[PDB]
């Protein structure tokens, strides 16, 4: 809170934090796509996709 209750300190730091975290989410999305890339997508049959890929 930065004090006794939810007040000015609170809302000013919550804006600053609201601006920051979207960029951390962006970095986590890149890490998400990195792990996706080494194994590729799955498919609705649940079996290997290796025998028939298209770009």
Task: Tell me how far apart the alpha carbons of residues 12 and 18 are, in angstroms, rounded to a whole number.
Answer: 10
Judged by CB, which is closer to ligand HEM: 11, or 36? Answer: 36
Judged by CB, which is closer to ligand HEM: 5, or 52? Answer: 52
Judged by CB, which is closer to ligand HEM: 41, or 50? Answer: 41
- Can you tell me which of 2, 6, 36, 49 binds ligand HEM, judged by CB under 6 A? 36
- Closest separation between CB of residue 30 and ligand HEM, Å? 9
C-alpha triplet 15, 21, 22: angle, nearest 5°: 105
Please state, as a whole number, how many other Cβ atoms lie within 10 Å of the Cβ of residue 10. 13
């Amino acid at each position: 809170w930065g004090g006794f209750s939810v007040s000015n300190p609170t809302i000013q730091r919550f804006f600053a934090l609201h601006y920051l975290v979207p960029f951390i989410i962006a970095a986590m999305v890149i890490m998400h796509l990195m792990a996706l890339h080494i194994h590729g997508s799955s498919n609705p049959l649940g079996i290997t996709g290796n025998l028939d890929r298209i770009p």
